């Protein structure tokens, strides 16, 4: 799967026209320790009792859905556009 | 153990015990997702008709009650 770096597409925020958009791939980002779920999990894990939450260990699928981050060049607002799952994904490869 | 997988036996007489019920077939149907720009105009038509009828009736009532 190959998609180009830029795309003329409708902008759904702050500028209601078709504009140029920079296209990149969205990345998950680290889970911060100060998130409420993480704090609750750490407090629960403290003490005796062992592992207190499930740990998933099945791992059926081998790919991930590809999420494009679209950044409008005129009104600097970003958007998410999910694509079908694929094994190989390149951004702006040769035609 | 091995179980009976499937059968449609007795299902028809179960269905016919309370009869095959028919849809109620009401006179009016909701126009919620049907033909916008047409049913909106129909709303305008009804409003105009109601306004004319109501103003004529109000005129008659006022002139008859003095």
């Amino acid at each position: 799967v190959n998609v180009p770096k830029t795309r003329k597409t409708y902008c759904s925020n702050k500028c209601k026209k078709h504009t140029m958009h920079k296209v990149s791939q969205y990345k998950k980002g680290k889970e911060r320790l100060s998130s409420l779920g993480r704090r609750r999990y750490d407090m629960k894990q403290k003490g005796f009792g062992g592992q207190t939450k499930p740990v998933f260990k099945k791992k059926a699928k081998t790919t991930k859905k590809i999420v494009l981050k679209l950044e409008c060049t005129k009104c600097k607002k970003k958007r998410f556009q999910t694509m079908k799952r694929c094994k190989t994904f390149e951004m702006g490869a040769d035609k | 153990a091995k179980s009976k997988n499937h059968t449609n036996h007795n299902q028809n007489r179960k269905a016919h015990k309370n009869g095959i019920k028919k849809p109620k077939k009401h006179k009016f149907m909701s126009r919620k997702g049907l033909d916008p720009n047409f049913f909106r105009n129909q709303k305008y038509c009804l409003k105009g008709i109601q306004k004319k009828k109501k103003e004529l009736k109000l005129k008659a009532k006022q002139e008859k009650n003095n």
């Binding site: - | 299902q11 179960k14 269905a15 016919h16 309370n18 095959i20 019920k21 028919k22 849809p23 149907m29 049907l34 033909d35």
Partner: protein, 155 residues
């Protein structure tokens, strides 16, 4: 195990012998109005607006008309009750039903019969006849064609 949209439609959704190709241009000219009866016949050459397998050959009233589609109310049997279903199809897959054409012709004919019957104050039976037993007929036949029949032997 396999229950896709078009499962089991190998022959139902196939074009007839020497009847392939898109619909005629005259099909797009037919008039549809709200509440009139319509036949759902799937045309495999047009893939969008294709009705589900069950509704091919069914009849229903129009409840919605769009620019190239139509919504039709079809009764479908679901175990212990009939229930209404709103199927949305393109106009290629729908056709003006003749289920009531005899009714409309009867309506106009009976109207113009009753008009003159009341004009001449003659009382007329207007209902359909379901004709049964024939009267006695005093029929002539010359003896040149009263041929006698015998059961045939075996060969």
């Amino acid at each position: 195990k396999s229950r896709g949209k078009r499962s089991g439609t190998r022959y139902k959704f196939s074009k007839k012998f020497r009847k392939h190709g898109e619909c005629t241009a005259n099909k797009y000219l037919e008039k549809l109005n709200y509440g009139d009866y319509v036949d759902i016949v799937c045309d495999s050459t047009q893939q969008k607006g294709m009705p589900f397998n069950y509704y091919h050959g069914k009849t229903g009233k129009i409840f919605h008309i769009t620019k190239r589609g139509v919504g039709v109310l079809v009764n479908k049997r679901v175990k212990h009750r009939i229930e209404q279903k709103k199927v949305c199809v393109r106009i290629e897959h729908v056709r003006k039903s003749r289920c009531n054409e005899d009714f409309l012709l009867r309506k106009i004919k009976n109207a113009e019969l009753i008009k003159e019957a009341k004009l001449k104050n003659e009382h007329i039976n207007i209902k359909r006849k379901t004709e049964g037993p024939k009267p006695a007929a005093m029929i002539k036949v010359p003896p040149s064609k009263i041929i006698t029949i015998e059961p045939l032997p075996f060969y």
